[PDB]
Amino acid sequence: RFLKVKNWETDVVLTDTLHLKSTLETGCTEHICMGSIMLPVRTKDQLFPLAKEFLDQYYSSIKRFGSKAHMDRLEEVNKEIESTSTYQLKDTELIYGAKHAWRNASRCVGRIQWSKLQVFDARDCTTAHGMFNYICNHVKYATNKGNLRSAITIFPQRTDGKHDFRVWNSQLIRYAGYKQPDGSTLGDPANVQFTEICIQQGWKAPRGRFDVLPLLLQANGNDPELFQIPPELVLEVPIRHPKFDWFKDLGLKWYGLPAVSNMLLEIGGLEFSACPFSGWYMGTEIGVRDYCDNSRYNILEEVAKKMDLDMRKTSSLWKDQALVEINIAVLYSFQSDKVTIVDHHSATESFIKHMENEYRCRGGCPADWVWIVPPMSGSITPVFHQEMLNYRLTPSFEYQPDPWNTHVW
Amino acid sequence: RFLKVKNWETDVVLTDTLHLKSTLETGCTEHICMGSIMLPVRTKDQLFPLAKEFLDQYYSSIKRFGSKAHMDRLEEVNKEIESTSTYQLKDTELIYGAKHAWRNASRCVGRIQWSKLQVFDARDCTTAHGMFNYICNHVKYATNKGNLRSAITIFPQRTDGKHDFRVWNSQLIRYAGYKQPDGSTLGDPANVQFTEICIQQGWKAPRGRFDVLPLLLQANGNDPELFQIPPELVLEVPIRHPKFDWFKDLGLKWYGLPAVSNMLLEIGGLEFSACPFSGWYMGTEIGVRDYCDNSRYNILEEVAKKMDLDMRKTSSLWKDQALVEINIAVLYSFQSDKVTIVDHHSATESFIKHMENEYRCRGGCPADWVWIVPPMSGSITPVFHQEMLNYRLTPSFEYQPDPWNTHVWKG
Numbered sequence: 088r089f090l091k092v093k094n095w096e097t098d099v100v101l102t103d104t105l106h107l108k109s110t111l112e113t114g115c116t117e118h119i120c121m122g123s124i125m126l127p128v129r130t131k132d133q134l135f136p137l138a139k140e141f142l143d144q145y146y147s148s149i150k151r152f153g154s155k156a157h158m159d160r161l162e163e164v165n166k167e168i169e170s171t172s173t174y175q176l177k178d179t180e181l182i183y184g185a186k187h188a189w190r191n192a193s194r195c196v197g198r199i200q201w202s203k204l205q206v207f208d209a210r211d212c213t214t215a216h217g218m219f220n221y222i223c224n225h226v227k228y229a230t231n232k233g234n235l236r237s238a239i240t241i242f243p244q245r246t247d248g249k250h251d252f253r254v255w256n257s258q259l260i261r262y263a264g265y266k267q268p269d270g271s272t273l274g275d276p277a278n279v280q281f282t283e284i285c286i287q288q289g290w291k292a293p294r295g296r297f298d299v300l301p302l303l304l305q306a307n308g309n310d311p312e313l314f315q316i317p318p319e320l321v322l323e324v325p326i327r328h329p330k331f332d333w334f335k336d337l338g339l340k341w342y343g344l345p346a347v348s349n350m351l352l353e354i355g356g357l358e359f360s361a362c363p364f365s366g367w368y369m370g371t372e373i374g375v376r377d378y379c380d381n382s383r384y385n386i387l388e389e390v391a392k393k394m395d396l397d398m399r400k401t402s403s404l405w406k407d408q409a410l411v412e413i414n415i416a417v418l419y420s421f422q423s424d425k426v427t428i429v430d431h432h433s434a435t436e437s438f439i440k441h442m443e444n445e446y447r448c449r450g451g452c453p454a455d456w457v458w459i460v461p462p463m464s465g466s467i468t469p470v471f472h473q474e475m476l477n478y479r480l481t482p483s484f485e486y487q488p489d490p491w492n493t494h495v496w
Numbered sequence: 497r498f499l500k501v502k503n504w505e506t507d508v509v510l511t512d513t514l515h516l517k518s519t520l521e522t523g524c525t526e527h528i529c530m531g532s533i534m535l536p537v538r539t540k541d542q543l544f545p546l547a548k549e550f551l552d553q554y555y556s557s558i559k560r561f562g563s564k565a566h567m568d569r570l571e572e573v574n575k576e577i578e579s580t581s582t583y584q585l586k587d588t589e590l591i592y593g594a595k596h597a598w599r600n601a602s603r604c605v606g607r608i609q610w611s612k613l614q615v616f617d618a619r620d621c622t623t624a625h626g627m628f629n630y631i632c633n634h635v636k637y638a639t640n641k642g643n644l645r646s647a648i649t650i651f652p653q654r655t656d657g658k659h660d661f662r663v664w665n666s667q668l669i670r671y672a673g674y675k676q677p678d679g680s681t682l683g684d685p686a687n688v689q690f691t692e693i694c695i696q697q698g699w700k701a702p703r704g705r706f707d708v709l710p711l712l713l714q715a716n717g718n719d720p721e722l723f724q725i726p727p728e729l730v731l732e733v734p735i736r737h738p739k740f741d742w743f744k745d746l747g748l749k750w751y752g753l754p755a756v757s758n759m760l761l762e763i764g765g766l767e768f769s770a771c772p773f774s775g776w777y778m779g780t781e782i783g784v785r786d787y788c789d790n791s792r793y794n795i796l797e798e799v800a801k802k803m804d805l806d807m808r809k810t811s812s813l814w815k816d817q818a819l820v821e822i823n824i825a826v827l828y829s830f831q832s833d834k835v836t837i838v839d840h841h842s843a844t845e846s847f848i849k850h851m852e853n854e855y856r857c858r859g860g861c862p863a864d865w866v867w868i869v870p871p872m873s874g875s876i877t878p879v880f881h882q883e884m885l886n887y888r889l890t891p892s893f894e895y896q897p898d899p900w901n902t903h904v905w906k907g
């Protein structure tokens with residue numbers, strides 16, 4: 088009932104009480120832990136409870152719990168739900184809600200930043216064009232000439248499931264993927280299928296290796312339309328090493344704005360199916376996963392051949408040597424072009440400070456260890472030795488079916 | 497009920513039916529996951545069912561389930577339990593059990609070697625000196641002049657819990673730790689407390705950076721006794737780098753045999769409180785954890801200075817760079833001295849193969865991702881991209897409180 092988490096590097100212990108407000112399920116049982124499984128319409132009766140829970144905590148946060156203002160709103164919404172069968176969040180509730188869905192993102196290591204989120208209320212949007220306008224502005228605001236700023240743009244909430252707003256891209260910015268005759272894959276393998284639906288819809292693919300994919304926006308349930316983010320708005324960084332001049336010849340570049348666009352924001356029972364949100368990269372995301380993942384740009388072998396390493400035997404640890412370089416480059420290039428980026432050492436350290444704050448100010452902090460520990464140098468970052476408790480709190484960011492596997496054209 | 501796991505690097509999907517035999521708890525609930533949590537005397541009453549389940553698996557393994565031998569055994573064991581309150585395993589069952597405890601160790605990446613296990617039956621042992629001889633023979637056999645062999649020595653099972661046999665050391669071989677009055681620590685910090693106990697028990701500590709600790713053995717619930725392992729039996733490997741000739745001057749070395757001695761082996765309800773077991777290392781255990789954990793030898797800074805990396809800012813990834821070289825050095829030194837060891841690429845690759853085989857032939861392979869994933873380069877090893885199901889089966893290796901916290905001294 089009162090759990091305690093220990094850090095085996097500093098012996099420090101924190102007591103978690105926040106997990107007791109855990110609403111949703113985890114996918115685990117007393118017999119089986121699914122901690123490493125990537126992915127373990129509402130009704131009026133279902134909705135008022137969700138709303139009440141949200142509203143109670145919202146008023147609690149502003150120190151007006153059980154006040155008239157609180158009750159008043161609690162009834163206003165209640166009546167609205169009974170009459171309309173859904174409801175609208177007040178601007179204040181929308182912000183609090185979005186900031187808190189991030190606060191609860193148990194897989195996000197950079198939450199120490201959670202309170203500083205620019206929310207763009209896009210609920211008055213009605214068309215794919217209006218969606219394109221908002222997103223552009225979003226990109227521009229957050230990119231901010233390289234000095235990145237966290238932001239999220241929130242489109243209308245779901246109603247009957249047939250008028251859903253959705254951004255089809257997994258991220259606002261991503262390179263395309265084409266399966267060539269060579270049997271090989273050109274570009275980013277992760278987006279092969281998407282890059283095809285763009286062609287299937289009209290895109291004029293430059294069939295290059297780093298073509299910024301086009302936005303496929305879906306409004307009010309209609310069919311998605313295509314748009315090409317203004318090139319001047321997509322800030323990119325060419326990748327070079329601070330010692331290996333031959334590096335630049337790999338012709339590697341990556342975009343500065345990480346912006347997740349396929350998730351579903353849930354606040355007080357309400358569902359926001361289109362809510363792109365962005366921050367800034369942690370070195371490893373690009374250098375370790377995007378570049379080295381075997382099923383992504385898989386550049387290890389190449390960077391190895393160029394380093395003149397004994398790739399004859401695994402035990403020489405050449406992959407480990409290449410990996411550290413590739414990641415030194417990323418952090419290097421970005422810091423040079425003055426684009427925001429944080430390294431895995433500094434990021435994990437910040438998350439530790441954040442965890443203590445959350446434990447002593449909120450009573451805990453849900454955290455998914457499998458995701459928090461960077462994909463490289465694991466045990467040399469503090470979070471490796473930090474025990475974590477994982478539970479689901481709402482408001483939240485949830486996953487949702489890729490739209491193409493559901494859209495009734 | 498079937499459960500499926502997917503590999504996100506190869507899109508391979510496996511189905512688990514084995515978890516359906518999982519009895520013990522996990523620490524998790526539908527509301528909370530404790531996957532990253534380190535550590536979440538029986539009655540005649542609760543013993544026979546446990547004895548029964550075990551013998552059923554045993555007999556099925558030899559394809560004699562329901563045979564006359566099987567039923568008589570079950571009847572024999574029942575009788576023995578009603579009569580003595582416990583029961584003795586047959587040599588064949590003890591060996592089957594130990595192998596399966598290993599096979600079921602979800603935190604072990606080396607499980608592909610599970611069937612090749614040398615089981616030493618030390619159930620006839622009665623004193624600490626008796627234990628010392630046994631442990632010495634295991635160390636010699638297991639070391640095999642550098643060509644390591646997996647082995648486990650099994651002493652008498654617990655009876656009334658007042659006569660436990662325990663090996664106080666956490667590992668058969670390990671360096672001492674000394675706390676200095678100036679706050680710093682000499683040797684391995686992880687063993688400072690245990691070292692104090694040894695000194696207190698009469699150990700003349702040579703106070704060096706790499707002093708092999710003495711064995712503190714407890715037999716039949718009596719007070720533990722000290723023994724020094726024959727130096728000529730402790731295979732050690734001095735650490736040097738292939739390209740850096742200054743590495744050797746760092747003064748590092750490490751013992752060649754990893755042998756966990758503080759776990760409890762549970763087979764068919766019976767509890768084996770003293771059951772040392774050993775195999776061979778994966779580079780990273782020494783190179784990443786033992787050497788680089790801040791709470792261990794913490795050698796990252798000194799290895800950084802010598803290589804002259806930009807240590808002013810973390811983004812130069814100096815710490816990451818040094819690390820690779822330190823692990824390269826550990827692997828290198830062991831291969832040069834012909835002492836068995838395996839790198840993490842090689843070890844995880846084999847586990848995936850082992851794991852797959854276990855699904856096809858067993859219906860599952862319980863695995864703890866948090867522990868299976870190596871402490872460095874996680875994503876460039878196939879296990880990182882592999883979903884895993886963690887659950888408990890017996891026979892099994894469990895944790896038990898350190899004996900100094902529970903032992904009732906006799907003076």
Ligand code: HEM
Nearest residue numbers: 189192194195196197200237238364365366367368369484
């Ligand atoms: C500004 C600094 C930020 C940093 C350094 C950061 C870093 C990270 C990292 C390392 C991950 C794992 C990424 C992966 O492996 O796919 C992650 C995931 C996530 N982050 Fe953050 N983040 C930041 C901002 C944000 C913002 C502004 C939000 C939301 C408002 C957010 C929401 C999440 C969520 C929901 C996940 C999990 C999404 C998924 O499954 O891919 N993050 N973050």
Ligand code: HEM
Nearest residue numbers: 598601603604605606609646647773774775776777778893
């Ligand atoms: C053949 C060589 C072997 C290799 C390379 C291998 C490797 C490993 C590694 C890397 C770990 C995690 C180490 C740590 O962080 O503490 C581990 C844990 C473990 N291994 Fe193995 N293993 C081997 C043999 C064995 C044997 C022979 C047994 C049992 C008969 C065994 C039982 C276990 C168990 C029970 C754990 C968990 C230890 C704990 O939870 O404290 N291993 N193994």
Ligand SMILES: Cc1cc(N)nc(C[C@H]2CNC[C@@H]2NCCNCc2cccc(Cl)c2)c1
Nearest residue numbers: 125126345346347364365366367368369372
């Ligand atoms: C705001 C933000 C900031 C920041 N720094 N990083 C992120 C993370 C996103 C950008 N880098 C990768 C991740 N998006 C991909 C998440 N999906 C992972 C995945 C892979 C296969 C299947 C599934 Cl279901 C999910 C988001």
Ligand SMILES: Cc1cc(N)nc(C[C@H]2CNC[C@@H]2NCCNCc2cccc(Cl)c2)c1
Nearest residue numbers: 534535754755756773774775776777778781
């Ligand atoms: C047979 C075997 C083979 C092999 N290759 N490796 C091991 C693993 C042991 C040798 N490397 C470290 C580990 N020791 C036991 C792990 N316990 C860690 C610990 C420390 C402090 C507190 C806790 Cl709770 C746990 C065992």
Ligand SMILES: C[C@H](O)[C@H](O)[C@H]1CNc2nc(N)[nH]c(=O)c2N1
Nearest residue numbers: 123124125457458880881882883
């Ligand atoms: C199979 C396993 O769940 C999967 O590879 C996870 C592991 N940890 C991760 N951690 C982060 N941050 N991001 C990921 O995409 C993953 N993938």
Ligand SMILES: C[C@H](O)[C@H](O)[C@H]1CNc2nc(N)[nH]c(=O)c2N1
Nearest residue numbers: 471472473474532533534866867
């Ligand atoms: C707190 C956290 O669970 C702890 O640091 C774990 C993580 N994974 C590990 N994995 C292995 N193999 N060995 C360990 O000692 C640990 N420590």
Ligand SMILES: [Zn+2]
Nearest residue numbers: 115120524529
């Ligand atoms: Zn779990």
